[PDB]
Structure 1
Amino acid sequence: MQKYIVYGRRLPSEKFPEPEVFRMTIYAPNEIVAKSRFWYHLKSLKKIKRTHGEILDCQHIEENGDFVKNFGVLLRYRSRVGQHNMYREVRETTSARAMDKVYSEMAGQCRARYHDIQIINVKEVADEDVRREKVAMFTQKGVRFPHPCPYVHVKRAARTARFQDRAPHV
Structure 2
Amino acid sequence: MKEYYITARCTDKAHNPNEIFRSRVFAPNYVVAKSKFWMMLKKQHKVKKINAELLQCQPIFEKNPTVVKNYQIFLRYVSAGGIHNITKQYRDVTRVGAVRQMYNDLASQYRTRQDKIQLISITTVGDKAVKNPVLHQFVGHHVKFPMVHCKPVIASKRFNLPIKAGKLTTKLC
Q: Percent identity of the aligned residues?
A: 32
8 A contact 1:71–1:98 mirrored in 2: yes
The CA RMSD over aligned residues, in Å, is 2.3
How many angstroms apart in 1 are the aligned matches of 2:29 and 2:149?
33
Summarize the Cα distance change of 1:135–1:67 in structure 2 as closer, same or farther, 3 Å threshold: same
Give the TM-score, by structure 1 length.
Answer: 0.88
How many angstroms apart in 1 are the aligned matches of 2:107 and 2:149?
23
Alignment of 1:44-83 (within 5 A): 44-63=43-62, 64-83=64-83
Aligned residue identity for 2:71: F
Residue in structure 2 matched with residue 97 of structure 1 by the alignment: 97
Residue in structure 2 matched with residue 23 of structure 1 by the alignment: 22
8 A contact 1:70–1:135 mirrored in 2: no
Q: Are 2:132 and 1:116 aligned? A: no
8 A contact 1:5–1:25 mirrored in 2: yes
Q: CA deviation at 1:147?
A: 1.5
Residue in structure 1 matched with residue 136 of structure 2 by the alignment: 136
How many angstroms apart in 1 are the aligned matches of 2:46 and 2:169?
64
How many angstroms apart in 1 are the aligned matches of 2:165 and 2:31?
50
8 A contact 2:12–2:51 mirrored in 1: no
Summarize the Cα distance change of 1:71–1:167 in structure 2 as closer, same or farther, 3 Å threshold: same
Please, which runs of 5 or more residues in structure 1 have no aligned partner? none
Runs of 4+ in 1 over 6 A off after TM superposition: none
Give the match's secondary structure for 1:57: strand
Give the TM-score, by structure 2 length.
Answer: 0.86
Please, which runs of 5 or more residues in structure 2 have no aligned partner? none
Q: Deviations over 1:90-143 (max 9, x none)?
A: 000011110001111011111222221100110011112112223321110111
Residue in structure 2 matched with residue 165 of structure 1 by the alignment: 166
